[PDB]
Amino acid sequence: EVETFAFQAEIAQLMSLIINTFYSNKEIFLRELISNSSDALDKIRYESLTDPSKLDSGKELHINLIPSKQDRTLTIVDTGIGMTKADLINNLGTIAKSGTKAFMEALQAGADISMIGQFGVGFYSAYLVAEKVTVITKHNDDEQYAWESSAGGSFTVRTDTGEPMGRGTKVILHLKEDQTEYLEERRIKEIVKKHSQFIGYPITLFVEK
Numbered sequence: 001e002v003e004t005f006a007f008q009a010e011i012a013q014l015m016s017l018i019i020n021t022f023y024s025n026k027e028i029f030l031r032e033l034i035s036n037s038s039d040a041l042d043k044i045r046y047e048s049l050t051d052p053s054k055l056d057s058g059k060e061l062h063i064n065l066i067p068s069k070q071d072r073t074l075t076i077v078d079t080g081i082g083m084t085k086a087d088l089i090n091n092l093g094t095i096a097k098s099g100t101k102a103f104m105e106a107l108q109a110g111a112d113i114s115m116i117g118q119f120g121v122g123f124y125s126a127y128l129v130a131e132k133v134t135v136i137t138k139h140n141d142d143e144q145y146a147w148e149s150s151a152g153g154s155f156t157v158r159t160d161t162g163e164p165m166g167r168g169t170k171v172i173l174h175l176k177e178d179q180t181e182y183l184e185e186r187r188i189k190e191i192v193k194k195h196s197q198f199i200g201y202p203i204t205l206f207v208e209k
């Protein structure tokens with residue numbers, strides 16, 4: 001069964017801003033999502049040092065970038081700590097309220113959309129390139145969930161019954177029709193080299209079949 005939730009007002013207005021503001025430098029979404037993956041991997045690696053059983057759901061700590069021209073999706077996969085149901089429905093948004101308000105005020109005070117990560121809400125940069133984002137995620141001691149939103153003020157959460165992932169997060173970017181350059185191997189290599197060269201986990205750019 002599918003539950004539908006309203007975004008907090010401040011997040012809904014930030015998402016509209018990211019969708020409606022004219023900003024050509026859209027490629028920064030990838031740096032932000034890789035940064036989020038890296039942070040998630042840091043967290044589970046740190047926790048595993050006092051409770052090694054936290055890696056029973058998988059010892060590999062990595063990031064995969066998977067384009068699909070058939071599906072017009074770019075997927076960012078990590079084996080990080082994952083997100084709980086409470087994370088997805090309430091707690092990440094509660095944390096994000098402060099930075100979202102500060103980011104919006106900074107934008108009026110001359111700041112640039114590329115600074116979104118400095119306010120801790122970089123996930124929403126996905127809507128620079130995606131008409132819809134699907135997030136599949138699995139945290140130890142919670143179930144595997146699918147979060148999804150095409151903006152418009154609402155998101156859904158459901159228990160996922162696709163291929164179990166062990167632990168981690170998959171961000172599936174359903175790309176806008178004029179943003180398919182982010183399916184090109186060369187374009188992704190260029191972006192990762194430029195913004196993400198010093199990430200401390202293996203980043204594998206998968207190749208289209």
Ligand SMILES: Cc1ccc(Cn2cnc3c(Cl)nc(N)nc32)cc1
Binds near residue numbers: 037
């Ligand atoms: C709906 C939504 C999805 C993602 C984020 C950013 N974010 C927070 N926790 C994360 C973990 Cl554990 N892993 C990854 N990859 N991203 C994470 C915020 C809101």
Ligand SMILES: Cc1ccc(Cn2cnc3c(Cl)nc(N)nc32)cc1
Binds near residue numbers: 037091092122124
């Ligand atoms: C494990 C992990 C923790 C924190 C982040 C940072 N981060 C980026 N975007 C975010 C949004 Cl939208 N909400 C919140 N709460 N945090 C966000 C990423 C991964």
